[PDB]
Each structure stands twice: as structure tokens, then as C-alpha cells.
Design an enzyme around this catalytic site. Structure first.
Site, PDB file in Angstrom:
ATOM      1  N   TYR A  53      25.100  14.958   1.739  1.00 45.81           N
ATOM      2  CA  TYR A  53      23.933  15.632   1.186  1.00 45.81           C
ATOM      3  C   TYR A  53      23.443  16.534   2.332  1.00 45.81           C
ATOM      4  O   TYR A  53      23.238  16.061   3.450  1.00 45.81           O
ATOM      5  CB  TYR A  53      22.872  14.603   0.785  1.00 45.81           C
TER       6      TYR A  53
ATOM      7  N   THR B  27      31.035   9.541  -3.845  1.00 49.01           N
ATOM      8  CA  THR B  27      31.828  10.769  -3.797  1.00 49.01           C
ATOM      9  C   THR B  27      33.329  10.492  -3.874  1.00 49.01           C
ATOM     10  O   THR B  27      34.045  11.126  -4.642  1.00 49.01           O
ATOM     11  CB  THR B  27      31.497  11.539  -2.520  1.00 49.01           C
TER      12      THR B  27
ATOM     13  N   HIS C 290      29.070  15.607  -3.723  1.00 46.09           N
ATOM     14  CA  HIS C 290      28.376  14.834  -2.684  1.00 46.09           C
ATOM     15  C   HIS C 290      27.437  13.797  -3.265  1.00 46.09           C
ATOM     16  O   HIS C 290      26.880  13.989  -4.332  1.00 46.09           O
ATOM     17  CB  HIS C 290      27.658  15.725  -1.630  1.00 46.09           C
ATOM     18  N   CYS C 291      27.295  12.698  -2.531  1.00 46.00           N
ATOM     19  CA  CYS C 291      26.269  11.711  -2.816  1.00 46.00           C
ATOM     20  C   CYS C 291      25.232  11.803  -1.690  1.00 46.00           C
ATOM     21  O   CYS C 291      24.661  12.882  -1.506  1.00 46.00           O
ATOM     22  CB  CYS C 291      26.865  10.324  -3.031  1.00 46.00           C
ATOM     23  N   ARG C 292      24.981  10.725  -0.949  1.00 43.50           N
ATOM     24  CA  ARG C 292      24.154  10.820   0.266  1.00 43.50           C
ATOM     25  C   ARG C 292      25.048  11.040   1.502  1.00 43.50           C
ATOM     26  O   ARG C 292      24.905  12.052   2.195  1.00 43.50           O
ATOM     27  CB  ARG C 292      23.243   9.599   0.392  1.00 43.50           C
TER      28      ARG C 292
END
EC number: 3.1.3.48
Length: 282
Positions: A75, A224, A216-218
Site C-alpha cells: 500500500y 496480494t 496490493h493489500c497492506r
């Protein structure tokens, strides 16, 4: 036997060895190092493979799993938003899949800017966000869709479809069924957008570095990686690509943490089993 506990243990053994090999050393030549004093990595231990890095100031990587080409990233940090938008535009991004939840984004302790649900100006780049459709994924999981119009003097204007899983858990893994639904949605959205570019004779079609779904995730290693695994299994070109192959490829091309949790790997294994796809290489 091919999906039995001993095969699963063997897969885990191979992947653990790889994670160890790929662990970053101090100033590791294999990993992107910050220039200019600004923070590069959202997490100190989650680094960005240098040879596949998209931009010198982003934690983001080109990944090819079998034939399937994507970009996986963290992220973006607040400081990285202009560079992130330039990446999205230059890639003519056919879909941006954001797997971090609204709860995560809302937690200001986490430093995750709400960059795709709101409009704004970031350095030279002006971004307009518009809400589009909403698609249920199963188990009450909902994908909210947006379009981001990215404008910058000297650059062609680019609109990027966004698939945001606003209630994607981080404490638990989503099921193989939800993962499949999400992969299909992300693939379909990318297909529609890529077709538009093809219909206009875009030069990006001939360029391997472009027209990549961005995911994307975090941290860009768990949710992801689970999604990218599912997407590669959805690709008709990838017959016989094993789970060992897909995970090792993600790891060598981003970092050794790709598919971080056993809970995520379980999903990939179930999806593979459903297709009669091998877990291990002979």
C-alpha cells in the site's frame, strides 16, 4: 497422495528453504535500497526485489507467474502517492485491485492514504475518483469499484478501473470460493479495459512492462499473493504450472514472504486440487 499431508509438508519444506535463502541481508544487492532519505518500505522486513522493481522509489515488483504478468506492491506511503499514480498511468493499468479493507485504511495509525476513493492533487498529478459498480464475492464479501482518472501536464490522461474489497478480512483468510470470485472479477475487469486499449491501437499492447493488473493489500505479500496465485490458475496458458512453481516465482520476483501464511497457501492448494494441478515439481 499428490494432495496428501506428506506432499503438503514437502511443499512447505521447499518453500521454507526458499524464504530463508531470500531473507534480506544488510544492504542486500538483491533488494531495492532507499535513495534520498525518504522511507521506502512500509515494513522493514518486507523488501522489494531490485531487478524486478517498477520504480526506484516504490516497493513494487513486476511478477510473472507462468505466463501471467502482474505488478504486486505495498500500500503506497503518503510520500509515495505521486510516484504510485505515475506508475499506474504509465502501465495503462487495466485494473487496480486493492485488498486492504476500509477498516485498515480508516485506522490512521496505519498510514494508508485513502488515495482511490477520493480525488486529489499530488505534486503535478491530479486524480479524480468516481464510484462505479459493486459486486458480491460470497460470504458477504463485497467488491466496490471505482475509476481513477489520472491527469498530468505532458502525459496522456489515463483512467484506471479499481476493484476494492472494502471488507476483506486481515485476521482470517477468505475462502477459495471468494478468492476465485475475486480473481474472475479482477481478470474480467482487466480484460474489458485491455480490449479498449487494443481497439484504439495502443502501443502499450506490444510492451511486456505494461497493461499489468496492479495488486496490493497492506504489505503486498499475503492477500496480494493469494490473489495472484488464483489469477494465474485462471489463465488458460498455465497448464501444468505447479503450486511450487507459482510460489517460488512470486518469491524470487518480489521477496521470500510472498504467500506469507499457511492459511493463504491452503487456499492455493485447494484451488490447485480442484483443477488437478500439481503441488510439487517432479
Amino acid at each position: 497422495s499428490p494432495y496428501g499431508p506428506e506432499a503438503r509438508a514437502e511443499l512447505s519444506s521447499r518453500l521454507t528453504t526458499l524464504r530463508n535463502t531470500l531473507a534480506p541481508a544488510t544492504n542486500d544487492p538483491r533488494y531495492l535500497q532507499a535513495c534520498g532519505g525518504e522511507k521506502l518500505n512500509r515494513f522493514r522486513d518486507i523488501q522489494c526485489r531490485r531487478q524486478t522493481a517498477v520504480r526506484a522509489d516504490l516497493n513494487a515488483n513486476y511478477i510473472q507467474v507462468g505466463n501471467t504478468r502482474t505488478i504486486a506492491c505495498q500500500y503506497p506511503l503518503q510520500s509515495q502517492l505521486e510516484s504510485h499514480f505515475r506508475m499506474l498511468a504509465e502501465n495503462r493499468t487495466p485494473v487496480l485491485a486493492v485488498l486492504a479493507s476500509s477498516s485498515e485504511i480508516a485506522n490512521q495509525r496505519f498510514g494508508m492514504p485513502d488515495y482511490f476513493r477520493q480525488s486529489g492533487t499530488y505534486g503535478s498529478i491530479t486524480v479524480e475518483s468516481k464510484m462505479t459498480q459493486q459486486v458480491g464475492l460470497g460470504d458477504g464479501i463485497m467488491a466496490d469499484m471505482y475509476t481513477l482518472t489520472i491527469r498530468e501536464a505532458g502525459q496522456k490522461t489515463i483512467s484506471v478501473p479499481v476493484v476494492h474489497v472494502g471488507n476483506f478480512p486481515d485476521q482470517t483468510a477468505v475462502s477459495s470460493e471468494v478468492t476465485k470470485a475475486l480473481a474472475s472479477l479482477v481478470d474480467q475487469t482487466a480484460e474489458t479495459k485491455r480490449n479498449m486499449y487494443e481497439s484504439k491501437g495502443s502501443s502499450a499492447v506490444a510492451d511486456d512492462s505494461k497493461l499489468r493488473p496492479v495488486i496490493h493489500c497492506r504489505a503486498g505479500v499475503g492477500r496480494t499473493a493469494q490473489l495472484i496465485g488464483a489469477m494465474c490458475m485462471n489463465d488458460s496458458r498455465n497448464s501444468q504450472l505447479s503450486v511450487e512453481d507459482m510460489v517460488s516465482q512470486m518469491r524470487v520476483q518480489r521477496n521470500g514472504i510472498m504467500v506469507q501464511k499457511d492459511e493463504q497457501l491452503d487456499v492455493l492448494i485447494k484451488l490447485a486440487e480442484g483443477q488437478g494441478r500439481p503441488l510439487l515439481n517432479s
